[PDB]
From Swiss-Prot, chains B, D:
Residues the record lists as binding substrate: 141, 163
The protein's name in its UniProt record: Arginine biosynthesis bifunctional protein ArgJ alpha chain 3
Source species: Streptomyces clavuligerus
Feature type site, description Involved in the stabilization of negative charge on the oxyanion by the formation of the oxyanion hole: 104-105
Transmembrane segments: none
Length: 203, 173, 203, 173
């Protein structure tokens, strides 16, 4: 499924370039799911010929990131037969690895995906999904907080209810999740589940 | 927009629509390459070769066929993989281990090698540079839009294309 | 959630009863997936009052199994808005844990689930799914064999093609997978993915 | 068909359809219980109590409410859980730790306790035994068919009911 090729004329130290490339792929292309079906063919390449001279590596990783993250969002906005992007902002994990683990499970929950497709701020399903991380016993359902947009819906006026409904009617939906454990943070990307996805992949 | 980056694209019939499904991107100049790939246990021949080719950190191009992943194609599929990678290499005059090969689409389906062999005979360095816009397009499978991003960094030009919106949750190394 | 309660009047040694109950739940209710959404409320109980006298434990585990496996198939045949049951028979694993790992991934693949919904013997998707088991480096794609019904389709006359098509047109579809490593074996259960599931969970 | 197993079922209004959504199954006799449960981090009050009650290996019944999971219901939901479990126990005259409680359906929604309290006052041992057919029915949520299996083993009768066809991939311990 996934093929992505980058090309630059900046001159970059081979070693430092390989690190900033992994670091960026980990926060970008390794942080997106449409249907969990990791493929037999995923490929991500960066070619850097020096026909533009030395460029500050720390500034190229920023640009490489902004660029990778731009394609990622395109991918997730164009998920097969999707209609809205989903972004799971996980914070307060014990560490980033965990925070990602939690985002993936949330963003791959068919019930979560369908709730979102239905414009439903179904935090109970977000909670359920969070719950599926059953080996993460420092996840305390009393310390977990869940939000749609900026608006926090868990733990549980009429204006904020309307704010959230408008947020879920849109095409890019943000699920915020704080675990209240440590400083672990990570954001993943995916989409709603629709009959179009089924119809295309069924046909 | 990146200096010394050309883009070749052309119909080879990996699907009967006459659309561009065969692409090569190349630096007219030697280039440092970084790359990460699927780790599937059913990872096709193309992934294997790419891994090798990026070992030394040196590679200049990549040939990309769409509407056939050349996966679970057995030995015949491995040979077709080597053949097409080497062929593209010779045509543009480059070391084997500097040409990568990527392949997306149907699985368990052999290539159209009579038609791929024929197009291999006309493979030449393209005059003029650029053409990311039409590589973005020639790699698509189930995508509905082409995917292409452009960013300027300290005088250099970085440009990326991407494809894939199903069978999709990457985890590359 | 999943809730399942069993009741018997057989007399059973408490300890031996608890073991045969876990063993059976592991091969039955812990071996089914409709949408991977492990719930906050899953509960499985067995009550055994002795008002029928001692019964041979080895014979009760057989009957408990046949009984559990009957309900499990009912569950997977009635998956939300499904229309066909899917049974992944994995054999030749290095062990059973692995063989189950593989069946779960297969039976939870949205592309596999949709392919099946579409009456499509899409072994390339079955292969893909198997491939997702990327930490299982003794899985050799050259030694893997895949079948629909009795008919083996991987590695890849007209009569057998028609046999498979009829198999996938039915409501109970069997995916056989041999890994050719050791003796590990395990069967899991699930269903196709349909627009009904999405429609119900979206509404 | 199993000796000393009665089945109570009745509408308590966990949803406004007048359908049976409140069930109790009980052995008129002491019973050894085996049980495994979700391990969700959001596992509702009911699961917790059940775990306790099956600690000694001794339990005789279980009250089951459908169309409300009583999950993420905070302290109020915990109390409602203990209350309903204890109430059912007293009514049939049994130790607290021999009555299990299961709860399926909507999450983050409190019980209808005024209506559940009222029905608790009329809770009596049912004359006659059996009625698994209608417990199977009174536990359903999004199921479309009732789920019930019967098997005979060396002179004993084993009968099981099941429910759940969504939010469904069990992994119990």
């Amino acid at each position: 499924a996934l093929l992505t090729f980058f090309a630059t004329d900046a001159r970059l130290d081979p070693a430092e370039q390989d690190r900033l490339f992994r670091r960026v792929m980990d926060r970008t292309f390794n942080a997106v799911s449409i249907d969990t079906d990791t493929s037999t063919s995923d490929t991500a390449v960066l070619f850097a010929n020096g026909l533009a001279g030395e460029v500050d590596a720390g500034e190229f990783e920023e640009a490489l990131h902004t660029a990778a993250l731009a394609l990622v969002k395109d991918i997730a906005s164009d998920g097969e037969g999707a209609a809205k992007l989903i972004e799971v902002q996980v914070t307060g994990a014990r560490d980033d690895a965990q925070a990602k683990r939690v985002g993936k499970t949330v963003v791959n929950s068919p019930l979560v995906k369908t709730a979102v497709h239905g414009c439903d701020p179904n935090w109970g399903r977000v909670a359920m999904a969070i719950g599926k991380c059953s080996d993460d016993t420092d996840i305390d359902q009393e310390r977990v907080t869940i939000r749609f947009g900026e608006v926090e819906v868990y733990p549980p006026d009429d204006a904020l209810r309307a704010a959230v409904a408008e947020h879920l009617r849109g095409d890019e939906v943000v699920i915020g999740i704080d675990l209240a454990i440590a400083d672990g943070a990570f954001t993943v990307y995916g989409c709603d589940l629709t009959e179009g996805y089924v119809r295309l992949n069924s046909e | 927009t990146p200096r010394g980056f050309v883009v070749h694209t052309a119909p080879v019939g990996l699907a009967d629509d006459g659309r561009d499904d065969f692409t090569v991107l190349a630096s007219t100049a030697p280039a440092t390459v970084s790359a990460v790939f699927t780790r599937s246990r059913f990872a096709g021949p193309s992934v294997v070769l790419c891994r090798e080719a990026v070992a030394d950190g040196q590679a200049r191009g990549v040939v990309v066929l769409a509407r056939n992943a050349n996966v679970a194609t057995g030995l015949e599929g491995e040979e077709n993989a080597r053949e097409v990678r080497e062929a593209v290499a010779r045509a543009l005059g480059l070391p084997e281990g500097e040409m990568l090969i990527a392949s997306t689409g149907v699985i368990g389906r052999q290539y159209p090698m009579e038609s791929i062999r024929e197009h291999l005979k006309t493979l030449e360095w393209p005059a003029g540079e650029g053409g990311f816009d039409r590589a973005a397009r020639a790699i698509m499978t189930t995508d509905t839009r082409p995917k292409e991003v452009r960013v300027s960094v300290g005088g250099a030009t970085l440009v990326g294309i991407a494809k894939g919106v199903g069978m999709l949750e990457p985890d590359m190394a």
